[PDB]
Amino acid sequence: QISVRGLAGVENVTELKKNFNRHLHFTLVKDRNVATPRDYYFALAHTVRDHLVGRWIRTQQHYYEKDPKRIYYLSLEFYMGRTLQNTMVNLALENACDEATYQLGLDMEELEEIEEDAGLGNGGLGRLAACFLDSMATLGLAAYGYGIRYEFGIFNQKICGGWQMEEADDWLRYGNPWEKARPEFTLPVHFYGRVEHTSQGAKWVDTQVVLAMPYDTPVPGYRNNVVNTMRLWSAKAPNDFNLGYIQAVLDRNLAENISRVLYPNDNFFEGKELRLKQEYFVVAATLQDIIRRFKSSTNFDAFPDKVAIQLNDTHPSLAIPELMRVLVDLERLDWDKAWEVTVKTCAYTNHTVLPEALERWPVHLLETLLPRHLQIIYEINQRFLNRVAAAFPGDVDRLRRMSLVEEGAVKRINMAHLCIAGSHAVNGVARIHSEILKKTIFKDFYELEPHKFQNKTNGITPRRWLVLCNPGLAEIIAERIGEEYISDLDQLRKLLSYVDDEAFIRDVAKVKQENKLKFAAYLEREYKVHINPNSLFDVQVKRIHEYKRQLLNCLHVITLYNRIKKEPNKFVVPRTVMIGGKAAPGYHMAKMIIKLITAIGDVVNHDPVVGDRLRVIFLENYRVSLAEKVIPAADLSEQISTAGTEASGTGNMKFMLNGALTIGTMDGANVEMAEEAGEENFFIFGMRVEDVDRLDQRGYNAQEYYDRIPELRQIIEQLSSGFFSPKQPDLFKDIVNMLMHHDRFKVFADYEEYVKCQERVSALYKNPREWTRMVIRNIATSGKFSSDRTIAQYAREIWGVEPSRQRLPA
Amino acid sequence: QISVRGLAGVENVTELKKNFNRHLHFTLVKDRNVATPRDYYFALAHTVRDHLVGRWIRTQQHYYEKDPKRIYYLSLEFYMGRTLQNTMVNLALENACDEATYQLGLDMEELEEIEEDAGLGNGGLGRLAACFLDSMATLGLAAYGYGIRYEFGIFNQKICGGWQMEEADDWLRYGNPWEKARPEFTLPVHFYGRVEHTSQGAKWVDTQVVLAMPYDTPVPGYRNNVVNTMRLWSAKAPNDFNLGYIQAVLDRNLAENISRVLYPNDNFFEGKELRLKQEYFVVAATLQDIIRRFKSSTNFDAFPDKVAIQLNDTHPSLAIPELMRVLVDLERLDWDKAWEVTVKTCAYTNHTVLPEALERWPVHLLETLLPRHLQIIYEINQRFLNRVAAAFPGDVDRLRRMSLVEEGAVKRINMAHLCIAGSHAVNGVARIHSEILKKTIFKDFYELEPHKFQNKTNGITPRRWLVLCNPGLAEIIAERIGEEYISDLDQLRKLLSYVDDEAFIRDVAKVKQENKLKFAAYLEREYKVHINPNSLFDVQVKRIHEYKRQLLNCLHVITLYNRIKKEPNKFVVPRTVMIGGKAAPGYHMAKMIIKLITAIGDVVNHDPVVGDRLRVIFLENYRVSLAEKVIPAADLSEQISTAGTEASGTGNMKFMLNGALTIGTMDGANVEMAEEAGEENFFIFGMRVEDVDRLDQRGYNAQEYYDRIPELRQIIEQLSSGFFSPKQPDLFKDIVNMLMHHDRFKVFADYEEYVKCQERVSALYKNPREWTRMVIRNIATSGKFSSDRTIAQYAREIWGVEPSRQRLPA
Ligand SMILES: O=c1ccn([C@@H]2O[C@H](CO)[C@@H](O)[C@H](O)[C@H]2O)c(=O)[nH]1
Ligand SMILES: O=c1ccn([C@@H]2O[C@H](CO)[C@@H](O)[C@H](O)[C@H]2O)c(=O)[nH]1
C-alpha cells in the first residue's frame, strides 16, 4: 500500500505464506478450524523471527573475526514495548507480511494488537536504553545490552472509582517468541559470606551461590542486516540448594525472587535489600561474561581497548568495585594497575539531580551482603581523598563533601560519588542538565577533574517514533524528500523549503486529522468514552511526579472550566485534555493527583453547559504501545516541569517529531528544541532556572499568589470545599495543604504565565494554516533529537569507536 | 542395521537430514561450529516431534467426529522416563534417524543419553500409568492421561560416604520439547471459603482461586498412527492475586507451589496439606475439562455412556464428591440422579494392603480446605450406612467398620471406603491381591456388593520393555517368528518349539552376554568401578522398603561371603550382586538399609581372598532409564517380598521378558508368572500367605531362628559387633534391634529356604545350556504380562469400549 513499508514481491509473499502455515501446524500444533487470533499472532511472530536468525548468527560471527572493541550497555531497565512491527520495519518486511496475511484472510494490524509489551522499565531512563539499542545496531557498533529478565515488569494500571489499582504484569503467560534461553552459559553469582586474608591476598568465602541464566533477544539494525544482542539474566537456585525435603525444594524460590519483579519507583530511591541484590546480580554475571569474551581473542593492559562499559545511572555502579575485585583478588594484578584499567573501561550517565532519587546505600547492608565490595570501596575512597587533600591542601570541608562515605544517622555510600571516581567520563543528558551538574551537585568533582565531564543530549529512534507509529506522516515526508532521512534524521531540514507549499500544508494537516480520528475511535472501542475529534488534543503523558507538575495542568483545566461557566455563551477553542501515567505504588501524593484528575472529569465531562467544549480524560495504563498511539494524535505537548528538575525528557522529542506543538518551560531538552526550531515556533513560559534560585534565596510563599490572583483563589476554595468530591468534602486536603505550605516545585509561581501562554495556543489554533506552518517548522528541525546522533557522540567521544552505515552481506 | 527398527529409505533419510539442519539453525539458533551434543539432541528431538503433530491433530479430529466414549485416567503419578527413542520406535523411524545422524557424522545413541527422564512418579504405580498410556494408544482407545506437571520429579540420589543424599531433580532446566503449553484452556480451582445455604441450594463462597494451566504431551500408539494426549496441569496465581506491592508479587509463589514438587513417599501415607491441595487441584481442573468436552457433542443420563474415569489409587478420590458437587450444586440435578451418574462413571484401582499406605485424611483439614466436599462426604456416608443397616439389620459393628468416617483420637476420612462406595468397579492388580481384598480389608464391602470386585493383573509395555531396551533379543525373536508379537505378545508361545534348537540357544545366550558386556562398561565409564562379566548378575532393583526385604538379600550376601572365607579354596559360582533403589527422605530404616548395603561392599569388594568371586554393588539413582539398561543385563531377578505384601509387582515382568530367571516368594504377580511358565522353571521359596497368618496367630519370635541357625547367629553378631563399620561399632544397632524385636516382615522366617533356594540357582548356572533353556521357557510364556492384555480387560469389563488394532490413515 505505502512505499516506506518496502516491496511486496511475489516470491516473498509466497514464501511468507508457506512458513506461516508451517508454524501454525508444527509450532503451534493447531489448524485453521481451531486457531484463535492469538495463534495467528504467534504464527506470524515465528515466521518473522525466522528472517532474523541467519542475520543474527552472522553478525555474531563477524564480530568474532573482526574483533572490534565491544560496547556493554548495563541497565536495570530496558523498556522495549512490542517487537513484531519493529522487526518488520527494520527488515523491510512490512508490506510483504501485510500482503501475505491479507491473502490468508487475516488483518495484520489486528494481530499486532495481541503482542504483550515488554514493560521491563519505568519511564524515560528505561526507554532511552531501548532507543539506544536500536541506534547502536543501526550504526553498526558491536554492542550488547545487559540487564535482568524480570518475570513481572511495570504493573498494569487500572482505575477503579477514579483510583489507581495495580495489577501484576504477567507478560510471559503465553510465551515470548523473541527470546532464546541459553542455559549453557549459566554463571554463579555470590552473596553474604565473609572475607579471609592470606599470604597471597584477600579471599571471599562461605557465600550463597545464586545462578544467572541468560536469555538472548535479537536487536535488528535498520536495513543494514546487523542484529545485535540484548542479554537478560534470570535467577536460578543451584541443585544442592538448601539440600525437611519438601520445604528445601519450595525454598528454591527465595533465590529466584531476585529476578521476579521490576521495582516501580521512578525518580525515587528505595533502599531495599532485594533491590541491591538485583543490582549486584546483573553486574556480577555481566562482568564474568565480559571477561570470558575478552579472554577468547593474561593481558589486561589491552582490556580498555577491547571493552567499554556504560553505566545507565548508578544502578550498576557495583561494576566498579566488582571489576576491581576480579582483577585484584582473582587475576592478581596490583591495585594501581587494576584501577587504571577500571577507570579507562567505565563511564557513567546521570539522569537526575533530585536529591531523593540518588542512591545512598546503608553501610550495614553492604557489609552483610557484599563484605568484600565494602572493603574495596573504603580503599577506593581513601586513595581518592588523598588526591583531593593533595590538590586542595587544608580544605577539610571539601573532603567531607567529596567522600564516597556519608557520615550521619547511619553511614551511607554515595553511589554517584563512586561512579565519578571510577569512570573516565561522566555525562548529563541535556546541555542545561550537564551545566547544572558542573555548577551544583558535582562541582567539587568537576574542579578536581574537569576533563571527565561531558554532555550527550538525549534522543529517540525515528524508526519506532516515526516510521512505525506514524506511517502516514513518514510517507508524505518520503514523497517530497526520499527515504534516506529514516537513518539520517538531519535531512528533515530539507522540509523547510515546503513551509509555504499549499499541498504539503494540506497533507501534514490531513495526517494529523486521520491520526486523531483513529485514536478517537480507539477510545470508544477499547475504553467506551466519546471525544470530539475536532478539538485541540492537549496531552500530558509521562510518569506521575510532583516535579512534572500535572497539578499545574489541572489548575489550567479548572480555569478553562470556571471561565466557560462564567460566560457560557462565549466562544472558546474546544479541547480534549488527556493526561496519563502511572504512579509508583507507595507515592501517596502521586496517587492523589490521579484521583484529582478523574474527579475533575466527573464534573467537567457531565456539565451540559460545557457541552463539547472541554473534555478531561485520564489515559489508563500509559505504556510504550499506548504512547505509539496517542503521540501521533496530539496537537499540544505539555512539558511543564519546574525549571532545573527534568534532566532531559524524551516524550518531548516524540511529540516534536509527530507534529504536535510544545507548551513548556525552559527545562531539560526543551531548551535545545526551541533553539533548533526558533523560539517563535515554541510556546515557552515561566521561570528560568535563575528565577527559581532567586525565589529560593528569599523564600517561596505561596499565600502571596493566592492573595493576588482571584482565579487561583477560587480554584483553591473549590478544592477545599468539596466542589470536586461532594461526598468527601475534605478529600483533597493534602493537595491543598501541600500547594499552600510545602510545594517544592512552585506550582503557583508559574500559574499566571501558564494560563496566558495557553491563550496564545488557542489563538494560533483558530488559524489552521498557520498552526500547520508552525508544525512544519518543528518537524523539520527535530533532526538533532535522533538517538543516532546521540550514539554517534557517545561512540566518538566516550567509547573510542567509529560508527558505520554499511550493510553486512545478506 | 536390524530389521525390527524399520526402513531407512533414501527419501526419509534425506528428509530427516534437512529438517535436522533446519532446527539446528532456526530453532536452536546455532551452527555446526558452536553446537554441543546437547544442541544435537534437541535438533533431533524437534525433528522427530515434527512427525507426531500431523498424526496428533488428526487423532483429536477423529474423536471429535466419531464421538466414542472417552477414557480418563487420573493419576498423581506418570513415570514416563525418556521420550525420544520410544517415539522413534512407535513411528518406525529408528533406523532412518540412525542413518540420518550417522551421515551428519553423529552417534544417535550418544544423543539419546542427553535426554532427562521425566521422573513424574515414584515407582510401580507411576510407571504402570506410563505403560497404560502406551497400551491405550496402541489399542486405539480415546484415552486421556490427566495429572500434575511437577516442576521437580523424584529427587536425584547421590551416595556420599555410603549414605543417600537427595538432590532436586530440575528436569526442565534445558526445556522439554515434547510438551505444548496450552494457556488458552486455563481453569480456576477453588480452596478454603465457606458454605452458604439459599432457597435454591448450597453455595461455595469466599474462596481462593488458583489457576490450572494445561500442558499437552503426545502419546504415540505402536505403528497405528494413533496419538493420544497426556494433559498435565501447572499452578498459576491469578493477576489480582494478593493485589505492599513487591511482597504481593513475591507471594504469587504460595499459590504456584501446588505443582512444584512430587511427594517422594512410596507405599506410605503422609497427611500434609500441600499434598491434599495437589490432590484436589488435579481433580478439580480435570473434571471441568471433562464436563466441557462432554457438553460440546443439559443431559447427564448419557454422561456414563460418554465418560469413564479411572482412579489410580485413592489419590484422586476427591473426583467422587467433586462430581457430586458440580452435578448437584451447579447443574442442579437431584441427589439420587447425580449419584447414579457418579457411580456409573467412576471406577477404582487399589495397589496395596499395607495399613500405613492408606489415605486417611483428618477431618479438620477437609473442613478448612474443602468445606463443601466434607458435607457431601457426610451425606454420602449417611446414605451408604443406611444401605448397610438395611442389608445387615442389627450389625452395629459392621456399621462402624464400614463408615467412611473413622472415629478416634482425631476423626479421619477413609478415602478407600469412599472410592468403593462411589465406584461401580474396584480392582486389585494381581489375582492373589484381589482375593486378599475380598477376604481381608474390604470383606464387609464385598459382602454388600460382590459384583463390584474384579481383578486386572498388571502388565508392562513390550515396546519400551523389550523392543526399546533390548533390540538384540527383539531381533532374534523376530528372525524366527516375525514382528507381529510386538503388539500381540501371546505369540511368544511359538518360541516354545525352539527350546531344543541349538542355534536359538546360542543366540539367546549371545544376547545376554552382549548386554552384560555393555552394562559392565557402563559401570566403568559413568561410575568408575570394575565387575567380572562372566559372573551371574544378581539384581534387586525397586524402591527401598522393609516389605521388599532387601535385608533378606543382604543376609544371603553376607552368608556367601562368610562361606568363601571359611573355605577359601573351594569353587563357588561367582556373582555380581547389584541392589538399587531410592529411599523416601524421611524413612529412616530405608536409609539405614542403603548404608548397610554399601558397608557390605566396602568389606566384600576389598577382600583379596574373595577376589573376583563376589561383588556387591549399590546402583545409584535407580530410575526408568537406568532400568532400561540393567534389566536386559540381568541373569537373576530378586522378588522376595513377604507373601501378601507386594500387591503385584511389575519389575518382575520386565525381568521375565528380558531373559533373567526369577528367585521369589509366592507373592503378587509372581504367582501367575510361575503358573504361566511352570513352577519347575521358577525358583520359588518361603512361606505362602497362609504360613504367614499361621505364624501371626501364634506369634513371631525371631530369637527362635537366631538360636537354631548358627550361620544367621554369626551374621547378627558381625552386625552388632562392628565388623561392617569398624569406626562406629554400634552403627547398625537399629537394624539388629528391628530384626530381633519388631520385624513386621519376618526376614528370619524365610532365611533358610532362601539360602537353599539360592544354591539351586548357582547349580543351574553351572550348566549354561540348561540355564538358557529355562530362560527360553520364561520368555516364551511372558505374553500374559503385556499391558495390552491388561488394558483390553479394563476396556471390556470396566469401561465398556472395544479395543481395535486398526491403523488410522497417515
Ligand atoms: O529514576 C529516574 C531518573 C531519571 N529518569 C529520566 O531519564 C531520562 C533519560 O535520560 C530523562 O530524559 C528524564 O529527564 C529523566 O527524569 C528516569 O526515567 N528515572
Ligand atoms: O504407594 C504405592 C502403592 C502401591 N504401589 C505399587 O503399584 C504397582 C502397580 O499396581 C504394584 O505392582 C506394586 O505391587 C505396588 O506396590 C506403588 O508403587 N506405590
Q: Which residue has the cell 500547520?
A: A772
Spatial CA neighbour of A655 closest among A672, A667, A638: A638
List, in order, residues 6 or more apart from B634 with CB less than 8 Å away. B537, B539, B655, B658, B660
What distances in angstroms separate CA A614 from CA A87, A683, B459, one per listed residue?
Answer: 39, 21, 78
Contact A17, A104 (CB under 8 A): yes
List the domain boundaries for chain A: 1-459+787-810, 460-786
φ and ψ of A349, to 5 deg: -105, 125
List, in order, residues 6 or more apart from B243 with CB less than 8 Å away. A165, A166, A167, A168, B249
Mutate to test the interface with B, among A29, A170, A261 (most CBs of B within 10 A): A29
What's the CA gap between A180 and A217, in Å, rounded? 6
Per-window interface: B 541-570 vs A, CB < 8 A: none
Instruction: Specify the CATH superfamily of domain B460-786.
Output: Glycogen Phosphorylase B; (3.40.50.2000)
* Helix intervals (H) in B178-333: 245-250, 252-256, 273-295, 303-306, 319-325
What's the CA gap between A658 and A511, in Å, rounded? 10
Q: How far is the CA of B352 from the centre of ligand 2 (A)?
A: 6
Grid cell, residue B734, equals: 537399629
How much is the CA Rg of chain A, to the nearest whole Å?
27
- What is the helix (H) or strand (E) element at residue A157, kind and residue range? strand A156-160
Spatial CA neighbour of B388 closest among B375, B378, B402: B402
Contact B446, B420 (CB under 8 A): no
Contact A78, A132 (CB under 8 A): no
Q: Are B586 and A244 inside 8 Å of each other by CB?
A: yes
Hey, is the C-beta of A31 within 8 angstroms of any chain B C-beta? yes
Q: Are A245 and B586 inside 8 Å of each other by CB?
A: yes
Ligand 2 binding pocket mutation candidate from B352, B460, B549 (most atoms within 8 A of CB): B352
DSSP state of B747: T
What's the CA gap between B354 and B428, in Å, rounded? 13
Q: Nearest 5°: CA angle at B88, between B86 and B91?
A: 105
Q: Which residue has the cell 548356572?
A: B765
Q: Are B53 and A25 inside 8 Å of each other by CB?
A: yes
What distances in angstroms separate CA B265 from CA A329, B151, B154, B349, B353, one per listed residue?
Answer: 47, 17, 10, 19, 16
Spatial CA neighbour of A791 closest among A804, A780, A782: A804
Contact B165, B158 (CB under 8 A): yes
Give B220's strand partners: B227
User: Dihedral, CA atoms, A367, A371, A373, A376, nearest 10 degrees?
Assistant: 100
Grid cell, residue B674, equals: 510361575
What's the CA gap between B420 and B437, in Å, rounded? 12
What distances in angstroms separate CA A584 from CA A259, A590, A645, A647, B336, one per listed residue?
Answer: 19, 8, 18, 19, 56
How many other β-carbons are positioned within 10 Å of the β-carbon of residue A138?
28
Angle separating helix axes B471-481 and B502-527, nearest 10 degrees: 160
Contact B348, B374 (CB under 8 A): no
DSSP 3-state assignment of A641?
A: coil
Spatial CA neighbour of A536 closest among A639, A606, A613, A602: A613
**Cα of B287 vs its chain's centroid, Å:** 24
Which of B30, B181, B250 is nearest residue A257 as measured by Cβ atoms?
B250
Q: Residues of A108-119 as b/e, b for ≥16 C-beta within 10 angstroms? A: beebbebbbbbb
What's the CA gap between B127 and B133, in Å, rounded? 10
- List of E strands, B514-643: 536-541, 575-580, 614-619, 636-639
What's the CA gap between B802 and B643, in Å, rounded? 35
How many other β-carbons are positioned within 10 Å of the β-carbon of residue A17?
18
Half-sphere exposure of B780 (CA within 13 A, CB side): 20
Residues of B in contact with A167 (CB under 8 A): 239-240, 243
In a 10 Å sphere around its CB, with 0-12 CB exposed, 13-18 middle and 19+ buried, how is residue A242 labelled? middle
Contact A9, A103 (CB under 8 A): no
Instruction: Reduce the secondary structure of A655-721 to three states and give it as a string.
Output: HHHCCCEEEECCCCCHHHHHHHHCHHHCEECCCCHHHHHHHHHHCCCCHHHHHHCHHHHHHHHHHHH
Tally of residues, chain A? 810
What's the CA gap between B569 and B186, in Å, rounded? 70
Question: Which amino acid makes up residue B573?
Answer: V
What's the CA gap between A307 and A330, in Å, rounded? 19
DSSP 3-state assignment of B478?
A: helix
Residues of B in contact with A585 (CB under 8 A): 244-245
What's the CA gap between B471 and B486, in Å, rounded? 12
Spatial CA neighbour of B362 closest among B300, B316, B411, B311: B411
Half-sphere exposure of A223 (CA within 13 A, CB side): 15
What distances in angstroms separate CA A302 from CA A299, A308, A311, A405, A801, one per listed residue?
Answer: 7, 12, 20, 32, 15
Which of B25, B180, B261 is nearest residue A249 as measured by Cβ atoms?
B261
In a 10 Å sphere around its CB, with 0-12 CB exposed, 13-18 middle and 19+ buried, how is residue A808 labelled? middle
What string of DSSP letters covers A306-374? HEEEEEETTTTTTHHHHHHHIIIIIS---HHHHHHHHHHHEEEE-----GGGS-EEEHHHHHHH-HHHH
Hey, is the C-beta of A734 within 8 angstroms of any chain B C-beta? no
**Cα of A298 vs its chain's centroid, Å:** 38
Spatial CA neighbour of B786 closest among B487, B392, B542: B487
What string of DSSP letters covers B64-126? HHH-PPEEEEE-S-EEEE--HHHHHHHHT-HHHHHHHHHHTT--HHHHHTTSPPEEES-SHHH
**Which atom of ligand 1 lies closest to the CA of A265?**
1
Binding site residues of A, as ranges?
A: 31, 64, 292-297
φ and ψ of A260, to 5 deg: -80, -40
φ and ψ of A164, to 5 deg: -65, 125
How many other β-carbons are positioned within 10 Å of the β-carbon of residue B116?
18
What's the CA gap between B215 and B233, in Å, rounded? 6
% helix, strand, coil for chain A, step of 5: 55, 15, 30
Contact A44, A22 (CB under 8 A): no
Q: Are strands B412-414 and B405-406 parallel, antiparallel or unpaired?
A: antiparallel
Q: Nearest 5°: CA angle at A238, between A233 and A243?
A: 155
Residues of B in contact with A249 (CB under 8 A): 152, 168, 260-261
What's the CA gap between A515 and A512, in Å, rounded? 5
Grid cell, residue B100, equals: 540420518
Find the distance separating the first CA and the last CA of chain B, reported in whole Å. Answer: 25
What's the CA gap between A37 and A45, in Å, rounded? 12
- List of E strands, A497-613: 536-541, 575-580
What's the CA gap between A118 and B351, in Å, rounded? 49
What's the CA gap between A359 and A354, in Å, rounded? 11
Hey, is the C-beta of A517 within 8 angstroms of any chain B C-beta? no
How many other β-carbons are positioned within 10 Å of the β-carbon of residue B739?
22
Instruction: Reduce the secondary structure of B386-453 to three states and give it as a string.
Output: HHHHHHCCCCHHHHHHHCCEECCCCCEEEHHHHHHHCCCCEEECCHHHHHHHHHCCCHHHHHHCHHHE
Ligand 2 binding pocket mutation candidate from B76, B125, B314, B348 (most atoms within 8 A of CB): B125
Q: Residues of B658-693 as b/e, b for ≥16 C-beta within 10 angstroms? A: bbbbbbbbbbbbbbbbbebbeeebbbbbbbbbebbe
Spatial CA neighbour of A223 closest among A525, A484, A536: A484
Q: Are strands A360-362 and A412-414 parallel, antiparallel or unpaired?
A: antiparallel
What's the CA gap between A414 and B561, in Å, rounded? 72
- What is the helix (H) or strand (E) element at residue A288, kind and residue range? helix A273-295
* Helix intervals (H) in A23-123: 37-66, 84-91, 94-103, 108-112
Whether A351 is catalytic: yes
Contact B19, B106 (CB under 8 A): no
Q: Nearest 5°: CA angle at A306, between A302 and A308?
A: 115
Q: Are A253 and B253 inside 8 Å of each other by CB?
A: yes
Nearest chain A CA: its distance from B38 CA (Å): 9
What's the CA gap between B175 and B351, in Å, rounded? 33
Instruction: Specify the CATH superfamily of domain A1-459+787-810.
Output: Glycogen Phosphorylase B; (3.40.50.2000)
Per-window interface: B 377-406 vs A, CB < 8 A: none
Give B684's strand partners: B664
In which region does residue B572 sit, left (phi positive, over 0), alpha (psi from -120 to 50) or beta (all else)? beta
What's the CA gap between A258 and A150, in Å, rounded? 9
List, in order, residues 6 or more apart from A740 with CB less than 8 Å away. A702, A703, A706, A716
- List of E strands, B424-530: 426-428, 453-455
Q: Which residue of A has its CA nearest to B257?
A: A250
φ and ψ of B486, to 5 deg: -55, -30
What's the CA gap between A569 and A564, in Å, rounded? 8
Q: Which residue has the cell 553446537?
A: B35
- What is the helix (H) or strand (E) element at residue A148, kind and residue range? strand A143-148
What distances in angstroms separate CA A796 from CA A348, A401, B437, one per listed residue?
Answer: 16, 33, 85
Spatial CA neighbour of B189 closest among B169, B163, B207, B165: B207
Nearest chain B CA: its distance from A239 CA (Å): 6
What's the CA gap between B291 and B753, in Å, rounded? 55
What's the CA gap between B198 and B590, in Å, rounded? 53
Q: How far is the CA of B127 from the centre of ligand 2 (A)?
A: 9
Spatial CA neighbour of A593 closest among A751, A748, A724: A724
Per-window interface: B 671-730 vs A, CB < 8 A: none
Hey, is the C-beta of A56 within 8 angstroms of any chain B C-beta? yes
In which region does residue A218 sit, left (phi positive, over 0), alpha (psi from -120 to 50) or beta (all else)? beta
Tally of residues, chain B? 810
Mutate to test the interface with B, among A15, A65, A167, A245 (most CBs of B within 10 A): A245
Q: Nearest 5°: CA angle at A243, between A239 and A247?
A: 105
Grid cell, residue A209, equals: 551461590
Residue of A49, A372, A543, A582 marked catalytic:
A543
What's the CA gap between B195 and B370, in Å, rounded? 10
How many other β-carbons are positioned within 10 Å of the β-carbon of residue A18?
10
Half-sphere exposure of A279 (CA within 13 A, CB side): 28
Q: Is B135 annotated as a binding residue?
A: no
DSSP state of B460: B
Contact A659, A511 (CB under 8 A): yes
In a 10 Å sphere around its CB, with 0-12 CB exposed, 13-18 middle and 19+ buried, how is residue A669 labelled? buried
Which of B31, B173, B184 is nearest residue A57 as measured by Cβ atoms?
B31
Spatial CA neighbour of B455 closest among B433, B483, B475: B433
Grid cell, residue B290, equals: 471433562
Per-window interface: B 179-218 vs A, CB < 8 A: 180-181, 183-184, 216
- What is the helix (H) or strand (E) element at residue B570, kind and residue range? none
φ and ψ of B723, to 5 deg: -50, -45
Question: Which amino acid makes up residue A644?
Answer: G
Domains B1-459+787-810 and B460-786 share a fold: yes
Spatial CA neighbour of A647 closest among A465, A464, A455: A455
Hey, is the C-beta of B571 within 8 angstroms of any chain A C-beta? no
How many other β-carbons are positioned within 10 Å of the β-carbon of residue A291?
17
Hey, is the C-beta of B785 within 8 angstroms of any chain A C-beta? no
As annotated, the active-site residues of B are 351, 542-543, 548, 650, 654
What distances in angstroms separate CA B202 from CA A89, B77, B208, B371, one per listed residue?
Answer: 58, 33, 18, 11
**Cα of A427 vs its chain's centroid, Å:** 17
DSSP state of B25: I
Q: Which ligand is nearest to the CA of B653?
A: 2
Residues of B in contact with A272 (CB under 8 A): 246
What distances in angstroms separate CA A528 from CA A114, A531, A617, B675, one per listed residue?
Answer: 19, 10, 12, 77
Q: Residues of B533-566 as b/e, b for ≥16 C-beta within 10 angstroms? A: bebbbbbbbbbbbbbbbbbbbbbbbbbbbeebee
User: Dihedral, CA atoms, A709, A712, A714, A718, nearest 10 degrees?
Assistant: -160
Q: Nearest 5°: CA angle at B437, between B431 and B439?
A: 105
How many other β-carbons are positioned within 10 Å of the β-carbon of residue B203?
14
What string of DSSP letters covers A94-120? HHHHHHHHHHTT--HHHHHTTSPPEEE
DSSP 3-state assignment of B200?
A: coil
Contact B576, B615 (CB under 8 A): yes
CB distance B123 to ligand 2 below 6 Å: yes
